[model samples]
Target: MLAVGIVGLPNVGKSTLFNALTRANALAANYPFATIDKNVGVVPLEDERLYALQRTFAKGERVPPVVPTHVEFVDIAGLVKGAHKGEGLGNQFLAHIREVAAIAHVLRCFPDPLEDAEVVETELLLADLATLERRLERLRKEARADRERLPLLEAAEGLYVHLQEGKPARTFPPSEAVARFLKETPLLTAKPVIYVANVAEEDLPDGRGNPQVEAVRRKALEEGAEVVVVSARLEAELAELSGEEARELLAAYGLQESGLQRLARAGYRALDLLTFFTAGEKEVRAWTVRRGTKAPRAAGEIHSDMERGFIRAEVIPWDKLVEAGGWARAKERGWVRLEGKDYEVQDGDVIYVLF
Candidate 1:
């Protein structure tokens, strides 16, 4: 599972928020990274359907439907100014980031968040520039030998110019040359980010963010990213409570859900992910795939043999199957569909593979 790294300046509530988020069955013990410094936690994605499906199959030695979906969160050591310049554990922190597919940029609302965000953004921009500088230097040496490679070097030159202008590579205009060049390169700024706005308890109740939260939102807009509002203090407290108690507390607070749950869902969506399921007499299970995945590839997520010997798929929406009473009945109602390899697997699809 690709991890979502929690990163921010020292003492920005990242520690507290991460503690809260990781408190629920953290997998650091089982899924430890090679580096002992990294704190890894696995969080199950909440789906009410998992329990309902379990009830629907509850008669003949039915294995409870496993709702334990996978989402891993890692708390990266705190970052400081000049991090990309090898300052304040900069090298080690960046090394950790390279392994992650997404980032949760935590920003505190205690004070002006724009300035803090600006500091963090500048550090990220600097990291990219530092990387491009080294890359262009190496390319320059190669270009000196092969005149034909000069055009490729020019692509790096344009990227360097853009990074210097304080813009991330994600917003770089459409260019086949640049795209081809970037395909083989790893750019930190290119990773999708969710600006985690750490709000106070008062603002979280109505979901109205403070001034700093607004700054983070604007920054996210500029980068085409997302923002999630949360209260670190509150989440830590609630994380200690049971589900029923938490719901009771939330009801008393005049709220229906926790910001931490919203944060997880938002982070999950930021990865451009979709979920599908497979139901059987033994167990009902949820599977994750990237959005727009095809049926055969999605089948491979379950088993390589299923993909290798794939015939077709019987597909139906989860709701339809539930309403029809079961898969056997759903097929009788003609609600089950036979889909080819070309069929795109959709979110919440209940699939049965005929291999």
Candidate 2:
């Protein structure tokens, strides 16, 4: 499962959002783990298409396809402008960040998400600058002692000066190779960021178009960070309802979906994730894979054995697979494709492995 860390300033609603997401997914599955960490929460990836698959393929006549789901979120302590310099949990903040795959930057959308965005981003940049300075100093000594280390160390020093010029590593103009090299080294500002705009409860729905939301939107474009608009208060309330109650409430609020749902999908898109299904007699299950992932590599996600003994794949876009009504039927209609290891799996694809 992939996880994203939630970060923001105090009183900004990170916890509320985390709780809503956690509760929303609580009934989605009988999780294998009771607790990942106390501060952690998870939710299942519920795709509406799964129900459609059920109706089109089973209708209670056959075993239901397994609908796989996974989501993990780490709740981080609030951060301020000078956090990199100092709480009991303060110094550990960035360290916590280093453990996650990406950063979900939560910002206040009512007054000024822009100002809050600046504060949090500045701290991350400063944290990286300070860290780079220490690394450069250590590298200088190591380079002086070992002549072979000179070029790499000195080039790093040059990059440190660029950081001093007030540029985040995310936007520090560089080649793909250089970016890859830096990420290999794990630079703080190098992590991808997704901006979460927490607005006033009443400000949601059409609230997405307001100026404050626009401010957050503009900065996300400026930094390449993804944006998700949410009213944390509303999310908390919506997470407690049943299917009918949730829908009724949504209709009353004039919303087709909840903020938490939008947030989940946004994460998949921003993180380059997609889902594929694996079905058998017992059930059909969804598996998560990144976009552009090849078939054999995707097979690896199920089990290493599947990849190690790889042969070919029988594939169909999920919707079509359902419409075609079961594997035998789909195969008869030529909807299922026999693809080689080089086949690039697509989102909503249902695959059959022949190992």
Candidate 3:
């Protein structure tokens, strides 16, 4: 499963956002480390296109199941000031972060959001530095016996100094040898991260003109990361309402989309993922794949037999298929194209495999 870890310092609304996103009642208390054990939940990637396909293929009450792609979210315990030294549930939480594909860092959009973000990142940098130091100790002894280990040891030493200077592993310029070393020993800062600017409920609709959110956005831009501004408390409150009531409440705040919706969309981009659909009367399902996957490899995502016997793909843009009324009508209208194995899959593609 593609997983994104939610992390930050204590009392930053990480669990509030987690509860809203996963609809799981994990404890969201005011104190630190209230959520000791990690809470994991799956959030469906909401797409109206799948719902449209379900409507198009419905047989009265016999509408086929609509299986949308899901992203797993792990709510990790917060890190404190001395987290790198194993303070405040730090070591265990860092271990949890190592397993995630991407990170959603929550920032308190008050006082100074950028400052808090920097603190969290510094801990991650220190953690990486510590990791490199332990590995470098063993490599130093090995290099005396094997000349080939010399280059890797030098690269590790360089990365350790880089982290000491308050830089992240992702920003470190690596030589070919260093790149290979990093590939073998991944660092926490190497993971892609998105900053979640958690604003107060009063600062709803859009957190425009808020200096703290602006600061977070500026830092995110500098780091080539994404920033999502959301009121975690408000979103959690809204989640308790009915769908109609929720939309009404959002509209009352001059907003059209909820935090979970924005988070889910941003989460997909952060994870470098795209969605392709497999539609039929039996089921209208959405599947996730990496951005540049080719046709045959994407077919393999469904089943090995599909890839092994792959010949061509019948593909159409999701909306085009919906507008043209179905695969049969889309084929009649020439909207469905025969894509060979070389064709790269797209985000909203509705595909029918021909093997």
lDDT of 3 by residue, 1-355 (tens): 2677888777788777866865622222111232233476665666788999988777768888887776667786544456234345566666777877888889998546677778778767877887898989988999999988888889898888888888777777759868877877888887788898899977765578888888888898766568888899888888777667998878887898888778878888888899999998899988888898999989988788888789999999999998998888898999999999899999999988998
- Sorting all predicted structures by lDDT, with the top scorer first, yields 3, 1, 2
Candidate 1, overall lDDT? Answer: 0.77
Question: lDDT by residue for model 2 over 213-238, one digit each (tens)?
Answer: 78877788887788888898888888
Model 2, runs deviating above 4 Å:
30-35, 59-66, 78-89, 131-162, 206-209
| Candidate 2: clashing pairs of residues | 65-284, 66-283, 66-284, 66-285, 68-286
Order the candidates by TM-score, highest first — what do you get? Answer: 1, 2, 3
TM-score of each: 0.85, 0.84, 0.81
Estimate candidate 3's alpha-carbon lDDT, on a 0 to 1 scale. 0.79
Relative to the true structure, candidate 1 reaches a TM of 0.85
Per-residue lDDT for 1-355 in model 1, tens only? Answer: 3667778887779889877876764522234353244487766677777666666666766556455465667787644565234335566777777777778888888646667667766777888898888888888998899986677678889988888989887777758767766756768787778888887787874346466677777777887678888888888898889878988998898777887777768767877788898876677788888888899999998898888788899999988888887888898999999999899999989998998
After superposition, candidate 1 runs with Cα above 4 Å error: 27-38, 59-63, 83-89, 133-158, 173-181, 205-209
Off by over 4 Å in 3: 24-38, 55-65, 78-80, 83-89, 132-162, 172-182
What TM-score number comes out for model 3? Answer: 0.81
Worst 10 residues of 2 by lDDT: 80-89
